[PDB]
Amino acid sequence: VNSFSGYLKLTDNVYIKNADIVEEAKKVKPTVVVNAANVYLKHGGGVAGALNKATNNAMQVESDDYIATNGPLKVGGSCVLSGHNLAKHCLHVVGPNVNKGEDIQLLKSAYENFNQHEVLLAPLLSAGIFGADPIHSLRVCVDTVRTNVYLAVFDKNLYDKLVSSFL
């Protein structure tokens, strides 16, 4: 049993809810929240700017030190950093950004990072401002992630379309 509430069960291991991932993280304090990161860990907008804003910019300060030491992530890659006031850990995952011309086949590699964690609160990778098709991102998630993933979908209209269209 875990703390996640009000999710629709899609598969054995994937759950979905219309929710603000920031507000969900604040309530649950999950072991792992996933950030929709870029390779520079520059948290300006979407999931990254909002989580970063909710940490009072401490996520960005930590991230700048990580990049200064290690250099940029790979598209499809990840790193584990602090969850600050939101979670124990934040798994920063880089899905491909269609609005930068990145290979959508890298979305499966991105979701494979989730399999290193038994339970996660996450957004749909590559969806929203990353430019991919959200129905596609949910399909790749279901077909790639084997650990227990609780997906928060910000847009009520999109949530209803994802549920209604789910195979």
Ligand X SMILES: C[C@@](O)(C(=O)O)c1ccccc1
Nearest-approach distance from CB 114 to ligand X, in angstroms: 15
Site for ligand X in 86-145 (CB under 6 A): 123-124, 127-128
Compute the half-sphere exposure of residue 27: CA atoms within 13 Å on the CB side of its CA. 13
Whether the CB-CB separation of 21 and 27 falls below 8 Å is answered with no
Q: How far apart are CA 143 and CA 81, in angstroms?
A: 26
Q: How far apart are CA 25 and CA 63, in angstroms?
A: 19
Interface with ligand X: number of residues (CB under 6 A): 10
Question: Of 46 and 65, which CB lies nearer to ligand X in the complex structure?
Answer: 46
Q: How far apart are CA 37 and CA 57, in angstroms?
A: 15
- 23 is a site residue for ligand X (CB under 6 A): no
| Residue 44-73 contact track with ligand X, rule CB under 6 A, x = bound | --xx--------------------------
Nearest-approach distance from CB 163 to ligand X, in angstroms: 14
Which residue type does 153 have?
Answer: V
**Stretch binding ligand X (CB under 6 A), from 1-9, 78-86, 103-111, 147-155:** 147-155
